[PDB]
């Protein structure tokens, strides 16, 4: 019941009073983000709460965040919180722990270099043209457009060609065997898990694998079909080939190959589609920002020139818009590390087993570091003001050795979509648009209502 | 079902074919020991089997046993197999893992030194006189005596005075609050656990603590009564004081104090009582050995002189009888270590998670190292033949940093009992005696029938 619920009281750490068994999970009715901002406002820099029987310690001090994410990563704070039923996804880089994660991290790090990203921008740019082609149709209909569907179709077209080389227009091909099996996904079982963590091993013995054995065998058989058709018949630049070439520490196995590719699919579809919808909402509700970005894009790229890797990294106002949107909407919301052993960081005793949490959403809106946090102001990230941003308060991609390994890929992917879309269209709020935007009440950072806007042709 | 049952087939390791879910647990119908000897005879030096879904690898090569128990103890083979419902006994030295065990081992190692054992032999010898006093009564009745009851009463009298200083004659005091609460213990739930390991965390949330909350609070309140009555009112030589003094790495906590004392109670009652019964069986069925031991005891100790610490370690034939009995009856039966990470020891790939097992019982009776293993021959351990015994085939107390920390205490305790008993009595087989002795069919090394013998007065 209250087995470990007296931990934070024994250490003198404040926090909301936990209920037996449940802990503080009932305080999630307002959302992960609202619960973090209220605890930050009512407890100061450090507080604690319980996800069931699991004690969670939240820290907001910049030096402690640097100590947890960077200084004591390999020694104390290496792994993340486990785990609903895992299956074979234990070999996933974002799920692996300790030395197995370090092996996968070092094996997949050369894949996400800027040199390998630069070789992927011709393929990613191809579907930017496909994106505006499906947007040209939905704009000429003369009625609001749900940005979740055109960005989700674009985000999948990028992740299928970059991870496997499969080149399909998803929006106009409702069912290419590959598209549908990738669409087979995916509350309130997640809160049941956090309050019944002892029932997780039972879902392993009942062979209740979280992923359908049909799609799993598909991707596993689709990959082995690709590995066999390419060895040898008879130069490719996808994530699969970059991992196949690395197989010739110890090399990755064939099942480990499937595990990482499933990660990138989950990593690209949810995030890039949601962040692009957040950006277009801010661009539509701030037409002055949208015009200045279009004026910059027209300058570096004359007469709608095709965006390239070097021309994307030259646009400063584009990078300022992406960073300011990621401040208001950090899709990860939280950063988490498990304390492997008893440690003393910056004057605090952190006992073993406690989950250290970085409230990234609450830090991005804390009035102590941000002037008028609720407003979309891209000028915070200009070269004049960029210096005075603490890189441990603003952590949209995390920090330390276990930060987002696909940060460069995600930034390049979203910018290539924003450029081609803004070169052809302008976006204004319609009457179905939710103004102001409300966040989802669930456990995902997504708009409560799908973003609908007007789309004109330039 | 057969999730990891194909592990030993992938590594080319022989072993009995496992059944789905059950594995090889049905082969335990003949006993842990018979199953190890059959697998040793039918597979050679190395084989594998499954306790449910848990793969177990047995090794019999001396160099590999030394590598697992000594060379790669801290690095690879540090912890033992876990764990039915634990409760607060996670702080037990024999259950603790990794650095927490090393902390408890170094904190309790100075307690089991020969200097501290030498200061305990006057108190242990007091109950040797109590042992012969209760044996003088049960011998004058002129009928067979169950050695389990007089040795169990003696073994408890030693463990209560050495661990807490409580001085009570257990046999004639049926219920001293302390005696009974120590007698509140304790199949087929153990095999249910090995086949349902996922149900162990459920016994933790149901507050089904394996130890009754009544006796547990008793010992916890009995210890705090002793710690408070001794601090200060107002020189003691028990295990509790040796651990109380060590509290003034990091010092042991009050709950950690109770955990280790519970270990010593379980460690002393079952073993010393059972081994003494095994010794007296061999002494009775080999009267030539019993006479030569009594002739040696009468030499060093004239006219039944009181045995002392120095006089015990002088008796060679007494040490030869104890060692030969521990060969035929190693009460631990098996030595186990968990492989923490992928390692390559002496030409073998040991994957992570595999339990490495040392069949101590089967090694002590292997005809390759022992001539006529089934016969009780103390001359194997004479100074002439003692050199040619491999210390990794004969491992009655284990080996390496995690061997039996109470080996010296157990050897001194049993010898002090054997001396005082053999100084006064002789032992012959009666008609109720099970000849030849059969081992228990269960999961404990104890006689199938309780050892009953004739007891005469000298
Ligand atoms: C807007 C897009 C994205 C954002 C904002 C984002 C953000 C994050 C954050 C905050 C973390 C956790 C960092 C930490 O715990 O310190 C993370 C982890 C990770 N991300 Fe991303 N991510 C994005 C897209 C992607 C993409 C497209 C990929 C791959 C194709 C990717 C791959 C990963 C991986 C593998 C990890 C775990 C790294 C590890 O455990 O070593 N992410 N991401
Ligand atoms: C005839 C009596 C005894 C025998 C044959 C015996 C044998 C053993 C064996 C074989 C092990 C495992 C070694 C390994 O895994 O390598 C062990 C462990 C242990 N024994 Fe004994 N034992 C006896 C009595 C005792 C007594 C009386 C005590 C304490 C009062 C004791 C305390 C321990 C402890 C604490 C461990 C675990 C050590 C650790 O995990 O670090 N034993 N014993």
From Swiss-Prot, chains A, B:
Changing residue 407 to T: In allele CYP3A4*3. Induction: By drugs, such as rifampicin. Changing residue 429 to S: In allele CYP3A4*19. Changing residue 325 to M: In allele CYP3A4*11; unstable form. Pathway: Steroid hormone biosynthesis; Cofactor metabolism; retinol metabolism; Steroid metabolism; cholesterol metabolism; Lipid metabolism; fatty acid metabolism. Heme binds at residue 404. Activated by cytochrome b5. PROSITE patterns: CYTOCHROME_P450. It comes from the Eukaryota. Changing residue 160 to S: In allele CYP3A4*16. It holds the Pfam family p450. Changing residue 137 to Q: In allele CYP3A4*15. Its main location: endoplasmic reticulum. Changing residue 149 to H: In allele CYP3A4*10. Changing residue 105 to Q: In allele CYP3A4*8. It catalyses: an organic molecule + reduced [NADPH--hemoprotein reductase] + O2 = an alcohol + oxidized [NADPH--hemoprotein reductase] + H2O + H(+); 17beta-estradiol + reduced [NADPH--hemoprotein reductase] + O2 = 2-hydroxy-17beta-estradiol + oxidized [NADPH--hemoprotein reductase] + H2O + H(+); 17beta-estradiol + reduced [NADPH--hemoprotein reductase] + O2 = 4-hydroxy-17beta-estradiol + oxidized [NADPH--hemoprotein reductase] + H2O + H(+); 17beta-estradiol + reduced [NADPH--hemoprotein reductase] + O2 = 16alpha,17beta-estriol + oxidized [NADPH--hemoprotein reductase] + H2O + H(+). It is found in: Endoplasmic reticulum membrane; Microsome membrane. Chimeric transcripts, characterized by CYP3A43 exon 1 joined at canonical splice sites to distinct sets of CYP3A4 exons, have been detected. All are possibly produced by trans-splicing. The chimeric transcripts exist in 3 different combinations: CYP3A43 exon 1 joined in frame to CYP3A4 exons 2-13, CYP3A43 exon 1 joined in frame to CYP3A4 exons 4-13 and CYP3A43 exon 1 joined in frame to CYP3A4 exon 7-13. The longest chimeric isoform (CYP3A43 exon 1 joined to CYP3A4 exons 2-13) exhibits 6-beta-hydroxylase activity, while a shorter isoform (CYP3A43 exon 1 joined to CYP3A4 exons 4-13) does not. It is linked to Vitamin D-dependent rickets 3: An autosomal dominant disorder of vitamin D metabolism resulting in early-onset rickets, reduced serum levels of the vitamin D metabolites 25-hydroxyvitamin D and 1,25-dihydroxyvitamin D, and deficient responsiveness to parent and activated forms of vitamin D. Interacts with PGRMC1; the interaction requires PGRMC1 homodimerization. A cytochrome P450 monooxygenase involved in the metabolism of sterols, steroid hormones, retinoids and fatty acids. Mechanistically, uses molecular oxygen inserting one oxygen atom into a substrate, and reducing the second into a water molecule, with two electrons provided by NADPH via cytochrome P450 reductase (NADPH--hemoprotein reductase). Catalyzes the hydroxylation of carbon-hydrogen bonds. This is Cytochrome P450 3A4. It comes from Homo sapiens.
């Amino acid at each position: 019941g209250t087995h470990s619920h007296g931990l934070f009281k024994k250490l003198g750490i404040p926090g909301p009073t936990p209920l037996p068994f449940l802990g503080n999970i009932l305080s999630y009715h307002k959302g992960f983000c609202m619960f973090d901002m209220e605890c930050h406002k009512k407890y100061g820099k450090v507080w604690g709460f319980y996800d069931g029987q699991q004690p969670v310690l939240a820290i907001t001090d910049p030096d402690m965040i640097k100590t947890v994410l960077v200084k004591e990563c390999y020694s104390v704070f290496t792994n993340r919180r486990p785990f609903g039923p895992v299956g074979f996804m234990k070999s996933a880089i974002s799920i692996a722990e300790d030395e197995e994660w370090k092996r996968l991290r070092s094996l997949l790090s050369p894949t996400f270099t800027s040199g390998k990203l630069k070789e992927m921008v011709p393929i990613i740019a191809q579907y930017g043209d496909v994106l505006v082609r499906n947007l040209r149709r939905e704009a000429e209909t003369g009625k609001p457009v749900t940005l979740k569907d055109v960005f989700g179709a674009y985000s999948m077209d990028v992740i299928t060609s970059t991870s496997f080389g499969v080149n399909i227009d998803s929006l106009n091909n409702p069912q290419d065997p590959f598209v549908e099996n990738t669409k087979k996904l995916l509350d309130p079982f997640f809160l049941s898990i956090t309050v019944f963590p002892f029932l997780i091993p039972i879902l392993e013995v009942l062979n209740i694998c979280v992923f359908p054995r049909e799609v799993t065998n598909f991707l596993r058989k689709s990959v082995k079909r690709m590995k066999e058709s390419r060895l040898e018949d008879t130069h490719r630049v996808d994530f699969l080939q970059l991992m196949i070439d690395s197989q010739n520490h110890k090399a990755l196995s064939d099942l480990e190959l499937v595990a990482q590719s499933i990660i990138f699919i989950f990593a690209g579809y949810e995030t890039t589609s949601s962040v692009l919808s957040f950006i277009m909402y801010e661009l539509a509700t701030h037409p002055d920002v949208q015009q200045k970005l279009q004026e910059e894009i027209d300058a570096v790229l004359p007469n709608k020139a095709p965006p390239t890797y070097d021309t994307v990294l030259q646009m400063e106002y584009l990078d300022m818009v992406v960073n300011e949107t990621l401040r208001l909407f950090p899709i990860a919301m939280r950063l988490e590390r498990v304390c492997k052993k008893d440690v003393e960081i910056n004057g605090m005793f952190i006992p073993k087993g406690v989950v250290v949490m970085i409230p990234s959403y609450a830090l991005h809106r804390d009035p102590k570091y941000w002037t008028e946090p609720e407003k979309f102001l891209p000028e915070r990230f200009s070269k004049k003001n960029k210096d005075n941003i603490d890189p441990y308060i603003y952590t949209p991609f995390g920090s330390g050795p276990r930060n987002c390994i696909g940060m460069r890929f995600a930034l390049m992917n979203m910018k290539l979509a924003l450029i081609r879309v803004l070169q052809n269209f302008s976006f204004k709020p319609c009457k179905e648009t939710q103004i102001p935007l409300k966040l989802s009440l669930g456990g995902l950072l997504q708009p409560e209502k799908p973003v609908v806007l007007k789309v004109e042709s330039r």
